[PDB]
Amino acid sequence: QLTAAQELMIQQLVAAQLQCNKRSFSDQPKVTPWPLGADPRDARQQRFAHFTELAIISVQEIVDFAKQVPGFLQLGREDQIALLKASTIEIMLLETARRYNHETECITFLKDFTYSKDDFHRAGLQVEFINPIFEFSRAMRRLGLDDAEYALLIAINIFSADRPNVQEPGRVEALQQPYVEALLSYTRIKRPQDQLRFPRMLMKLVSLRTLSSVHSEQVFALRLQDKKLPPLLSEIWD
Amino acid sequence: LTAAQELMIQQLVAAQLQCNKRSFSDQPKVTPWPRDARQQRFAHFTELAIISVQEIVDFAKQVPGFLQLGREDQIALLKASTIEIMLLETARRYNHETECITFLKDFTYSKDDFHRAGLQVEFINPIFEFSRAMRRLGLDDAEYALLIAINIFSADRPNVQEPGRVEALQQPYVEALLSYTRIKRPQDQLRFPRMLMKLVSLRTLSSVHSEQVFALRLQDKKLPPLLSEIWD
Ligand SMILES: O=S(=O)(c1ccccc1)N(CC(F)(F)F)c1ccc(C(O)(C(F)(F)F)C(F)(F)F)cc1
Ligand SMILES: O=S(=O)(c1ccccc1)N(CC(F)(F)F)c1ccc(C(O)(C(F)(F)F)C(F)(F)F)cc1
C-alpha cells in the first residue's frame, strides 16, 4: 500500500496542477482566435501566432507549477532556470498527449479548443515534428495513464539531473527519486498484473528527449519561413 | 528465469565476448598516437571510432530479431544507436581507479587525450560523468548486453517504417532484464529503473555528440567516409 507521504505527494501535485490550469481558462478568450474562412498567406501567420500564444500560456503554467513542487525553489536559481528550459517542451508534449482523443485524432488545449494533424501543418509546422507528436500521443494513450501517473511523470521530468548547465545535479537527483519510488509503488498497486507498465512509462522520458531535439529542429526550420518565435519563447528555445 | 530467457541472455553475452575478441584482440590499425599532431590525434580517434562502429554492427547482427527486421529499419536503428552504444561501451571500458577508457593493453585515453584530439569541453565532461555514473550502477555483462539490445529496438528513432514490430522486439529484452535484476539483487528495486533512466541520458548525449561533429567541421575537421554515412 502507498504511504501517507506518497499519497500526499500525488495529491499535492494533482492540486497544484489544477490551480496552474486556471491560467488556461482565464487566458483562453484573450488569444488570437484560429482563423475561420481562409483561402490558400495572412492566415498561415495567424495560426502560427495562435500556437505561440498557447505555448506562452503553457510556459507560464509550467513556471507556476514548478514553483509549487516541494524542493524546487530551494535549488539555486540558475538550476531552476536550467531545469525549466529543458523540461518545458517535454512537459508540453506530455500535456499534448494527455489531451489527445483517438476518436477524433485531435489534441485539446486550454479546456475547449482542439487541433488535428492538419491544423498543426496549417500553422506551418513540418511533418518531421507533427508525426512523432501524434505517435507519442497515441502511444501515451495505449498506456492509459490517470492524473496521478501524469503528475508524477511531470515531477520526475522536472528533476532530471542530467540537463545542460545544472551545477548541483546531486541535489536534483535527491528530489527526483521519491517521485520515481512513488510511481513504482503507484503502478504496482493500480495494476499488480502488468509488470511492464512502469518500464514503458519511464521509456516515455526517453522518447521525450528525442522529441525535444525534433522541436529544436522545427524552430530552426521555422525561421526560414518568416516565422520567428516571439520574445518569451525565443529565450527558452532559440 | 525461463529456458528461453537463459538462452537469450547467454547468446548476447557470447556475442559481446566474440565481438570483442574479433575487433580488439590484435593491435588496431591506427595512425600512431604521437598543428602537426592536432590532425594526427583526431585521426587516431576517428579510426578507433570506426573499429567500434564495426564491432557494434557485428553485434547488432547477432541480436535475435534484428536481422529479421526490414533492411531500412535495420539501418535506421543502427544509425541512431551507434553513438549510444559507443557511450555505454566507453562506460564499460572506464576504469575509475585510473580515469581512462581502455580498449586493450596499451590503448587507454584520459580526459586530456580527448582534448588533444580537437574535442570540445561541451562533449568530454558529459562522456566522463556518464561513465562514472554507469560504474556506480555496477552492471555486469548480462545487464550491459541486454541494455544494448533494448537500446537497439527503440521504436521511436527517425525513419522507422515498422515501429510496432520494433516495440514488440524490445519487450522480451526488457522482460529479461527485469527478471534478471529481480533475481541478482532482489532487495534493490530501483536498480532497474535507474538503468532505464540512462537510456534517457544517452539520447541527450547523442545530441551533444552531433554538436561536436558540427563544431569540428568549423575547424576543417571532417569525418571520414565510414563515419560520415552515419553522423552528418
Ligand atoms: O502544448 S503546445 O504548446 C500546443 C500548441 C498549440 C496547439 C496544441 C498544443 N505544443 C505541442 C507539442 F506537442 F509540441 F507539445 C507546441 C509547443 C511549441 C511549438 C512551437 O515552438 C511554437 F512556435 F509554436 F511555439 C513550434 F511551432 F515552433 F514548434 C508548437 C507546439
Ligand atoms: O568509443 S569511441 O569510439 C572512442 C574514440 C576514441 C577514444 C576513446 C573512445 N567514442 C567515445 C564516446 F564516448 F563518445 F562514445 C567516440 C565517438 C565519436 C567521436 C567523434 O564523432 C569522432 F570524430 F572522433 F569520431 C567526435 F570526436 F567527433 F565526437 C569521438 C569519440
UniProtKB/Swiss-Prot annotation, chain B:
Lineage top rank: taxon: Eukaryota
> Which sites are covalently linked via Glycyl lysine isopeptide (Lys-Gly) (interchain with G-Cter in SUMO2)?
184, 222
The Gene Ontology biological process terms listed for this entry are: cell differentiation; cholesterol homeostasis; hormone-mediated signaling pathway; intracellular receptor signaling pathway; mRNA transcription by RNA polymerase II; negative regulation of cholesterol storage; negative regulation of cold-induced thermogenesis; negative regulation of DNA-templated transcription
Q: Where is the NR LBD domain?
A: 4-232
What modifications does the entry list under PTM / processing? Sumoylated by SUMO2 at Lys-184 and Lys-222 during the hepatic acute phase response, leading to promote interaction with GPS2 and prevent N-Cor corepressor complex dissociation.
The answer to whether keyword Nucleus applies is yes
Q: Can you quote a single GO CC term? A: nucleus
Subcellular location(s) of the protein: Nucleus
Q: Which UniProt key words apply to this protein?
A: Activator, DNA-binding, Isopeptide bond, Metal-binding, Nucleus, Receptor, Transcription, Transcription regulation, Ubl conjugation, Zinc, Zinc-finger
- Please tell me whether the keyword GTP-binding is annotated for this protein: no
Task of the protein: Nuclear receptor that exhibits a ligand-dependent transcriptional activation activity. Binds preferentially to double-stranded oligonucleotide direct repeats having the consensus half-site sequence 5'-AGGTCA-3' and 4-nt spacing (DR-4). Regulates cholesterol uptake through MYLIP-dependent ubiquitination of LDLR, VLDLR and LRP8; DLDLR and LRP8. Interplays functionally with RORA for the regulation of genes involved in liver metabolism. Induces LPCAT3-dependent phospholipid remodeling in endoplasmic reticulum (ER) membranes of hepatocytes, driving SREBF1 processing and lipogenesis.
Q: How does it assemble?
A: Forms a heterodimer with RXR. Interacts with CCAR2 (via N-terminus) in a ligand-independent manner. Interacts (when sumoylated) with GPS2; interaction with GPS2 onto hepatic acute phase protein promoters prevents N-Cor corepressor complex dissociation. Interacts with ABCA12 and ABCA1; this interaction is required for ABCA1 localization to the cell surface and is necessary for its normal activity and stability.
The family assignment reads:
Belongs to the nuclear hormone receptor family. NR1 subfamily.
Protein name (database record): Oxysterols receptor LXR-beta
- Its source organism is Homo sapiens
The shown residues of the full protein are 219 to 457 of 460
